[PDB]
Symmetry: C2
Subunit: 388 residues, 2 copies
């Protein structure tokens, strides 16, 4: 099979390497981006690691006609969008016009609105095929299918205990960090969405293989689709760990104006403070080789099975350094990218596409997740299950 991937950042490097590790399925891999340099660096790494060749193409993923021409040139079975998140709709439109399956990773309303047209074209769109969302969605579907009759509560718990060896650094555009600490919290309970003050709801949770970590309630994407798709849910929450050192830095930066997003004039030039913060901070890509420590992401659920109370904890632990030695990425890129390749394999071997005559736009929890969960184990994301 032929797969076309749009995007060559940290996540895209993981997806491409993982496809290169599965040559029984992924015979022709084509990488396309606005940045050829990153495509070539991925190409070179894959060759160094004995993973074979990839194709490299320049494309502007804002230009729907350019994407169509590229898709028509290669006739891929599926397009993997790991591009900039503002290009999801144009890539989905180019996939619609060429009747090509679609996956992305790294409000769903406008993507969901492609459902009718995708059904009419007999193509599949799989949204949020990363870890959270993605694997976390799969864990809930897995629990719904094999462990519960009804799931009453869902807590998604995301811990990064990584050490990037800098006094302060971010693994994303620092605007993402700003959003996490400054956006209102939001969760679902008893049929309603409840907002909180930023980082208001805090708990200490013990993450296996890491230990006790301060965990704070935030809004998260898959809460939306999961609340829509898991019948009977009474409470759904998402938590992320934040060290005091990190929060102290973010508070101090906010206090002096360095998280500002509006232009301010400095010596006759307009400068956006948080953009200048990105300039000051190291490039996240340079941190991958230094980062040590572990991630633990998973889902803690309570509910009933055969009229008996039950709790279930499904989680994954990843080691940043082990990820780096395997594919040249840290554990954030690894946990986000491995499931996207697993999703592409599901579509390429027809497990999710034509075996179920399934067309339209879906979130992971709506699909047959049994072979997906098995694929995650094989590709380096084994999960642990604690039943009580």
């Amino acid at each position: 099979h032929t797969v076309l991937q749009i995007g060559a950042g940290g996540v895209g490097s993981v997806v491409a390497h993982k496809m290169g590790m599965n040559r029984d399925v992924f015979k022709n891999i084509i990488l396309a981006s606005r940045s050829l340099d990153k495509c070539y660096a991925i190409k070179e790494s894959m060759l160094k690691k004995g993973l074979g060749e990839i194709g490299v193409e320049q494309v502007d993923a804002d230009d729907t006609q350019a994407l169509v021409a590229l898709i028509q040139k290669y006739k891929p079975k599926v397009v993997i969008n790991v591009a900039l998140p503002y290009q999801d709709l144009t890539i989905m439109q180019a996939c619609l016009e060429t009747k090509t399956h679609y996956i992305d990773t790294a409000e769903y309303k406008e993507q969901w609105a492609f459902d009718r047209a995708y059904k009419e074209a007999r193509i599949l769109g799989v949204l949020g095929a990363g870890f959270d969302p993605g694997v976390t969605n799969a864990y809930v579907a897995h629990a719904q299918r094999h462990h519960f009759d009804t799931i009453h509560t869902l807590d998604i718990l995301d811990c990064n205990a990584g050490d990037h060896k800098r006094p302060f650094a971010t693994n994303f555009n620092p605007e993402i960090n700003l959003r996490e600490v400054s956006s209102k919290g939001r969760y679902y309970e008893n049929g309603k969405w409840i907002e909180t003050k930023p980082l208001e709801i805090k708990q200490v949770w013990a993450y296996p293989q890491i230990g006790e970590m301060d965990s704070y309630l935030l809004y998260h994407e898959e809460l939306e689709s999961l609340v829509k798709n898991i019948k009977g849910l009474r409470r759904a929450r998402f938590f992320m760990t934040f060290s005091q050192n990190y929060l102290t830095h973010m508070k101090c930066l906010e206090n002096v104006g360095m998280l500002g997003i509006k232009e301010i004039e400095h010596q006759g030039v307009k400068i956006v403070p948080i953009q200048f913060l990105k300039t000051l901070l190291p490039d996240p890509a340079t941190l991958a080789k230094d980062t040590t420590g572990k991630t633990n992401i998973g889902c803690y659920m309570t509910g009933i099975k055969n009229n008996q109370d039950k709790t279930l904890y499904i989680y994954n632990v990843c080691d940043h350094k082990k990820c780096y030695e395997e594919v040249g990425s840290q554990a954030i890129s690894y946990t986000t990218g491995v499931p996207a390749m697993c999703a592409a394999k599901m579509i390429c071997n027809d497990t999710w596409s034509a075996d179920h005559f399934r067309a339209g736009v879906f979130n992971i929890e709506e699909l047959n997740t049994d072979p997906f969960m098995e694929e995650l184990i094989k590709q380096g994301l084994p999960y642990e299950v604690i039943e009580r």
Copy 2:
């Protein structure tokens, strides 16, 4: 009945001008000069608003010695007060030398060394003029405190600790009262003090103590180098140890550490979207204008000198200090207490020279620090101009 020319119209300069305007029996003609007429006019209007009379306003580049000379020749002031940028002190001293005009400076706090200013001594002597250095609070009043104690309380002073606490609350999450380069220098420069005939260096903020400041309470106080340690060790015979301490809150230090960690205290140009930007300069742009903080600041400052020594062969300790209230300073002259404590002693020094308490004749000409002068009337003047001192004897 005298004419005084003041160069510099910043926060401190506003205090100096207002205080001269409060003393029209001495300062009959006040002329302010700056590169920025806007700041001079704001001081002028405020003084008129407060019933303190008119001032002259002149534009000048204090880097141009010839321009300074022409300005001095126009007004023939009895004394020139330098409250300008600290890199113009030598040019203004040169213009005072060439016109044979007395010189005072204050707020040279923006590795300090008196060497180049002290080197004017011979020319100032030949010109029969006075150059009075560091006429602010610390240095300045602290110098006078030591001279006062030497004259009236001790036979020999063994130790000197200068203790500087600003407990002001400017009501912002974070702000500085200076150009942030000054804040950077305080937290990142090596400590330095004098003990047993030697200068000892420390790591930045290495030496810490908790000191109880009257009217404020216990405050974390950190050892730093400070300008007047140099002249005081040179001029106060018998000193065994001389140290300077400044209070810093945990909140303040935590902010400065976090800023340093992200590169926001950098002093080198970094390229951002094709433009060269100095991070600590962009920090100055982001932070509030220090002048706008004065109207909101509450709380107190306490600056003073703790000394031990001998008097009539009995052990003695002495604490001489000043307490200022930020809000009272704002209501009186529109400044906070930092500008106030720095500026009032400069005006007091100018009065000492204008009424001939401090003069250059009979071999008294040259360049001096405050502790070498007759401090009795200076100490008296500080009390009536709003800086009364308290004395704790033991």
